[PDB]
Amino acid sequence: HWGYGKHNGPEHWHKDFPIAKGERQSPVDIDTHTAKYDPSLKPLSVSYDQATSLRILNNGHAFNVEFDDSQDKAVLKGGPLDGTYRLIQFHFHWGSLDGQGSEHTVDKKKYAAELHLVHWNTKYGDFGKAVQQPDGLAVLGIFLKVGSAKPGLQKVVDVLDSIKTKGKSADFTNFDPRGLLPESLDYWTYPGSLTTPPLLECVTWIVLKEPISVSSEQVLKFRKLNFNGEGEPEELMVDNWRPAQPLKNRQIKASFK
Numbered sequence: 001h002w003g004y005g006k007h008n009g010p011e012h013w014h015k016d017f018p019i020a021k022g023e024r025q026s027p028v029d030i031d032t033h034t035a036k037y038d039p040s041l042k043p044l045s046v047s048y049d050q051a052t053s054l055r056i057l058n059n060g061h062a063f064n065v066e067f068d069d070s071q072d073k074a075v076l077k078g079g080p081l082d083g084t085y086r087l088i089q090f091h092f093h094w095g096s097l098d099g100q101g102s103e104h105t106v107d108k109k110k111y112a113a114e115l116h117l118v119h120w121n122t123k124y125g126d127f128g129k130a131v132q133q134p135d136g137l138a139v140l141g142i143f144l145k146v147g148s149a150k151p152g153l154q155k156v157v158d159v160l161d162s163i164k165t166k167g168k169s170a171d172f173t174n175f176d177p178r179g180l181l182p183e184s185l186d187y188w189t190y191p192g193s194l195t196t197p198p199l200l201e202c203v204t205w206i207v208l209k210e211p212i213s214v215s216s217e218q219v220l221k222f223r224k225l226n227f228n229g230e231g232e233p234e235e236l237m238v239d240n241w242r243p244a245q246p247l248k249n250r251q252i253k254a255s256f257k
């Protein structure tokens, strides 16, 4: 199956997922000089005060923190979005070393990691139906740089030893995703895709300009996870990022002048 290694990584995905060479693939490089302020963007609303986290899962590619999406609790609205988008999960992509790990790049610069908060458009009723629609998903992307520790991340870090291998999960109730945000909600936005197979072209990307800082110790613990299952030869879960894809017939819009 697909992965990130030399033999099943991003350069191979197109053989089973031909949309990998499609017209609005993600991630992309964000050229900050060509991005244009867009006055048509409405204020962005990240409304996570009633979020209900449930569980954390090592799925063999990353770890997902899953939320109750059975009703409107944690939602994302405004900005480029038409309607209400419910938070379903978040996960990260990261590197083997601090100089790489992000999926999006900013003027070609790679960050140490990238957080994706994944939301689906409630007009479509369920996630599976949303991923059959051009505007089915919205992903809020946040860059991580290494510096001071992020207190709102430490609970995540500290549970990772209990989900080291593929298929392991743990209870992860009462986690507040608001502690993962930076101060500013300035962002870039463009239409794109899932960055992992099945690579579906359903996503409105909203990428925050301000990174969060995490400590070296925090990201080092991400890198102790395993891609493999229990009992199998250890393959450290590192470099689980897709490189930037061609922009093609797209423009990146900025929320800020």
Ligand SMILES: N#Cc1ccc(S(N)(=O)=O)cc1
Pocket: 001, 002, 003, 007, 008, 009, 012, 013, 014, 015, 016, 017
């Ligand atoms: N054996 C094998 C194998 C290699 C690559 C992939 S792909 N196209 O999903 O990256 C799948 C299976």
Ligand SMILES: N#Cc1ccc(S(N)(=O)=O)cc1
Pocket: 116, 118, 139, 193, 194, 195, 196, 197, 198
């Ligand atoms: N199913 C699914 C799925 C959800 C989000 C993403 S991402 N890396 O574009 O946020 C990838 C796959």
Ligand SMILES: OC[C@H]1O[C@@H](O)[C@H](O)[C@@H](O)[C@@H]1O
Pocket: 049, 050, 051, 052, 173, 174, 175, 176
């Ligand atoms: O426990 C994590 C978070 O869960 C939410 O449902 C609560 O309303 C918040 O007050 C709390 O910070």
Ligand SMILES: OC[C@H]1O[C@@H](O)[C@H](O)[C@@H](O)[C@@H]1O
Pocket: 036, 251
């Ligand atoms: O035709 C002019 C228009 O070109 C488009 O490509 C830009 O997105 C708009 O901002 C601009 O007003």
Ligand SMILES: OC[C@H]1O[C@H](O)[C@H](O)[C@@H](O)[C@@H]1O
Pocket: 155, 159, 171, 172, 173, 174, 175, 176
């Ligand atoms: O908030 C997420 C998790 O943080 C810590 O692991 C707590 O001990 C646990 O009870 C909680 O589920």
Ligand SMILES: [Zn+2]
Pocket: 091, 092, 093, 116, 195
């Ligand atoms: Zn992702």
